[PDB]
Amino acid sequence: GPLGSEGPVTVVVAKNYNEIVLDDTKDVLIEFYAPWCGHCKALAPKYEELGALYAKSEFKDRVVIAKVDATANDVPDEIQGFPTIKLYPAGAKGQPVTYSGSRTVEDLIKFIAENGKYKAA
Numbered sequence: 001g002p003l004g005s006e007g008p009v010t011v012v013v014a015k016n017y018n019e020i021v022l023d024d025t026k027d028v029l030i031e032f033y034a035p036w037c038g039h040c041k042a043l044a045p046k047y048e049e050l051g052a053l054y055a056k057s058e059f060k061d062r063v064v065i066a067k068v069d070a071t072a073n074d075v076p077d078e079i080q081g082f083p084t085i086k087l088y089p090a091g092a093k094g095q096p097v098t099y100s101g102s103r104t105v106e107d108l109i110k111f112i113a114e115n116g117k118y119k120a121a
Contacts, residue, residue, distance in 0.1 A: 029066065031066070031084075032069075097115040
């Protein structure tokens with residue numbers, strides 16, 4: 001497949017964050033991380049998994065799971081720790097659902113499903 005590389009979840013740089021994540025055409029779940037982050041290492045098996053599910057199945061035209069490296073790229077966003085997760089719904093990108101990470105796929109489903117406007121579940 002042309003797009004079958006490791007990264008179902010759209011790794012968005014700070015360059016694209018305002019276009020991709022801050023897009024209201026779809027609900028975008030963003031994860032601010034660092035590659036050296038042990039917390040991110042616990043966020044990755046959910047992110048690329050759920051992200052796969054979303055960006056591979058019926059949601060790949062809908063909610064996009066995305067993530068930006070908050071320490072490689074200088075984000076104009078707000079960090080409420082070192083990493084942060086923020087759901088920018090397609091309708092309430094002005095009041096994202098700020099999170100630090102539940103470390104689970106379950107919560108992610110529930111996340112864009114309750115927090116998302118599309119209710120992606």
